[PDB]
Design a protein around this ligand. Structure first.
Ligand code: UA8
Ligand code: UA8
Lengths: 193, 193
């Protein structure tokens, strides 16, 4: 049942490594999952809905990992604290590059994908701003920019920079340098005056 | 001649304030420019080519303004130097929000738009890295990250942050706060250790 569903999702993620969603058919997804086309339509209204589900899965996986970290602080300095946090997104999305790539593109096209992305970005920015505020309250960070505005720009930076790196865009930061690059900018901008 | 061309471009930019390129027809562009459909096809192969030209115009306008600034340094501190530079992009793209919005979306869709964007981003990143290197050479900035990598991430930040603000995305930095926010992050990340 949800085995067929998981087979459909696994096929879609596998096929998206080779080509865009536009060049993948329902017949392609049905074939890979070992089901018929009408049986596919039982589980999903469209190939677009398959992608929405795959992205939902990835975004929630990142979110849950961040929640785990938030409840279980590593015992480090401020630089390492932010690095471990950014690393949740680097590893999670980085482990699902085809879904990430297809899901970012689908924002143009799909109100549900746009809203999914928007919902979680708002949550991650709010969490970021809450940590910056805590750092200021404890006297570890100076009161410079509005924390929510700073958080917004830094999150958008990470979105654009991580995804360009993963896609091998020209220009992009090399994937093996993107974590150090982002951590530098986060730490200097959050702690600097 | 190039009056009809300019009328076509002016119509397209006007129409793009109201709706996406998908909901604009060649017949729409011909009508607004006071020409027939075949006369349109004389000047442009497609509505897509009209957008490519409008974006080319905007991107070159920004580039030329930056070149002017590069030849004519304002006499200020380092914060103001970067602010004036970022402001070229804020004002130029900000004066053409519909073209910016449509042109960013067309990257998914159009190899020529993707390459145009890529070419100029590479140029602006190289210029950014050259200024950071000059600042380090003069002893004004510390030798932290690889300057080209730092430049890349900061440029990508500006791309994503400016365009989210202009489009009124959720989330976004308010347009009236985006310049201060970006300048802060640029200055702290370039001069901070
Ligand atoms: C404590 C924070 C939470 C937010 N962080 C992020 O990297 N968020 C971004 C990840 C890139 C992909 C899009 C989402 C924004 C840093 C750690
Ligand atoms: C001396 C630098 C040159 C580059 N700068 C930029 O803002 N570039 C970005 C502008 C946003 C739109 C996309 C292009 C990247 C800062 C000033």
């Amino acid at each position: 049942g949800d085995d067929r569903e998981l087979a459909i999702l696994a096929t879609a993620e596998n096929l998206l490594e080779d080509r865009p969603l536009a060049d993948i058919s329902v017949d392609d997804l049905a074939k890979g999952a070992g089901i018929s086309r009408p049986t596919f339509y039982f589980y999903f209204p469209s190939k677009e809905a398959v992608l929405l589900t795959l992205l939902d899965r990835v975004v929630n996986q990142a979110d849950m990992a961040l929640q785990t970290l938030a409840e279980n602080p590593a015992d480090t300095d401020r630089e390492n604290m932010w690095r471990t946090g950014i690393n949740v997104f680097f590893e999670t999305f980085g482990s699902h590059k085809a879904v990430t790539r297809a899901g970012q593109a689908a924002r143009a096209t799909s109100v549900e994908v746009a809203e999914l992305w928007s919902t979680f970005m708002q949550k991650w920015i709010a969490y970021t701003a809450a940590v910056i505020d805590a750092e200021r309250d404890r006297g570890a960070a100076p009161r410079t920019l509005p924390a929510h505005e700073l958080a917004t720009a830094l999150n958008l930076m990470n979105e654009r920079t991580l995804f360009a790196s993963f896609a091998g865009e020209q220009p992009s930061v090399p994937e093996a340098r993107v974590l150090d690059t982002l951590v530098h900018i986060w730490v200097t901008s959050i702690y600097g005056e």
